[PDB]
Amino acid sequence: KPFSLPSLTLDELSNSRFPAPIVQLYTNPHDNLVVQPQNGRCTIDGLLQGTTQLVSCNVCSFRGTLGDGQPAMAFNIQREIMLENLDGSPYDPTDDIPAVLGSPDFQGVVFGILSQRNTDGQTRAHEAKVDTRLARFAPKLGFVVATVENTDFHANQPCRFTPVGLGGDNNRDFNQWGLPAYGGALTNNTNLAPPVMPVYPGEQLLFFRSQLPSSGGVVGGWLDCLLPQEWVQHFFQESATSQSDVALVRYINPTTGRVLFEAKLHKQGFLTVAASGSYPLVVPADGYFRFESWVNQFYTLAPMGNG
Amino acid sequence: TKPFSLPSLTLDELSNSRFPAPIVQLYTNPHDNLVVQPQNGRCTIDGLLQGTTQLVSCNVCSFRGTLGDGQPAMAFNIQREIMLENLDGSPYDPTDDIPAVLGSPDFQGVVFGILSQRNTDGQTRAHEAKVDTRLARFAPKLGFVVATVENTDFHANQPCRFTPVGLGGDNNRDFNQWGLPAYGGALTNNTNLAPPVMPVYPGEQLLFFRSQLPSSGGVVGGWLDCLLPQEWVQHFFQESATSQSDVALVRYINPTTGRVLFEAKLHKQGFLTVAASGSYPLVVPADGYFRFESWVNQFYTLAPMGNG
């Protein structure tokens, strides 16, 4: 019940908003952004929020029953997935969540594989895209549309969508901080984990950053999470009582043992730093965060610099 | 000096250490005529990784490197070599004390997935691909594997990443989960292997954390057993707790009643055994969980498992 962090190094962690390794720490100003992801939301005393669930390989997956194909770009056949929960139990659209757990929490096209294993055991699997911006992207209601090129799919049989990366044509097709309309076009999102922002003037959010694969275009594919998936799992299991609203943490150089920078880990489940501008930190990827002490919101962090 | 513990994640909160897939069952079978020697998901309960085991869940069975030119040889009928890097993009050292590049598949089969690229100029593409671990040129110890593709839209001498999704064979005989690939290529001897595992108490059987993989063709079961889930591997690595004996007694608990459903031994080498006979999935709640009970010795007699 004393608070703790996992000791996994930066390059041992994975993203909580997509199954991808963490490759960088990244900071930027929060001006004209609402930062309100729904995956990778866990308070540091262990309360999961939004669409956050614990299975790393399930983030941005879908599972359910595949419907008939209809027309309408090689990916020009649309098939609906009537969703289940990721464990195969019936999805309850009335649960106090924004959408089926694991649903993507960004506007974009997820590229991956749609696989099937029929009731008789016959299997198939092919490329597929799930466009989270579509009017019929409605995982709160329990329906999404998959777009495919291949005609070899069976209606009224189980399916699983395994995400691999992005499937748009350019950077404008991917808006990582824009939430989808989970209930479909022209509906209001519900049960959202709240937005996050620095409270101390001059501070910026610090993200754990991945770079996703992409099926087309000159696409950066950068995806920021508030906490890596292992920190989410750790806080959930530990459920340590938060002695204040701010845990001071320090990032350590593994060679020297020297502190490289300080950050605040806020109780709501995100980091801030004393930095200005938009950049990836220059720090050893085999460094790691160490919990130091409980402080208050007036604590002044040492300037981060480049890291 | 450092007390032992298990993660408190339930069965349906865990993932496989030999492939990125959820754990769906606990499974037991006799070890007769099997050498059980997986190389992923190998961690001693005091935190020593072995074989090709690494800590990133989404990297298990992935490959990374530079894609080569296409050659012929039936939809997946173009072959392209991947010259491998480590999964973090650092240069792969074929002389490290490991069986193959960390994360390499540890079974004979065809891995179906996506081969993606981001060129030096930023242009991207990604398409279906298969990696057949039985091929003569499957040689991740040397640092080369062959990807088979249908799509002609790939660029040679540009970076690539293979993300595994499931199996890509045509039938159950194309997948042999306990058969190791020849990591150095055809007609070469494997090195630096995590050792085989087996029950020592007569009559006991291994207990596995089991997943079911997707498949691109055939009536394929896709069942994959690991010795420890990926989260236990991460936990033991971080904790590196003192093993007071070679055998930790653990019990699987019903979350509704709090009742013990069955007992198992968690051996220091990093695997479970049970007092059971035959080949079957346990009938237990998927939201149950293991609880560490005490340190015992190899003579401890487990209560019969039954169905679970």
Author numbering:
A (entry chain A): 225 to 296, 306 to 540
B (entry chain B): 224 to 296, 306 to 540
Tell me what the authors wrote about this structure, in their words.
NoVs recognize specific glycan ligands as host attachment factors or receptors for infection. NoVs interact with HBGAs or other glycans through their capsid protrusions that are built by the dimeric protruding (P) domain of NoV capsid protein (VP1). Genogroup II (GII) noroviruses consist of human noroviruses (huNoVs) that generally bind histo-blood group antigens (HBGAs) as host factors and three porcine norovirus (porNoV) genotypes (GII.11/18/19) that form a genetic lineage lacking HBGA-binding ability.
In contrast, the porNoV VA34 P protein did not bind these saliva samples (OD < 0.1) and it did not bind the oligosaccharides representing A, B, and H antigens either (OD < 0.1). However, the sequence compositions and the structure of the VA34 site corresponding to the HBSs of the TV24 and other GII huNoVs appeared to be conserved (Figures 4 and 7(A and B)), indicating that this site of VA34 is under functional selection over time during evolution. On the other hand, the V451 mutation in the VA34 P protein loses the conserved Van der Waals interaction to the α-Fuc of the HBGAs. Thus, the two mutations damage the structure and function of the HBS and explain the lack of HBGA binding ability of GII.11 porNoV VA34. VA34 P protein represents the first solved P protein structure of a GII porNoV.
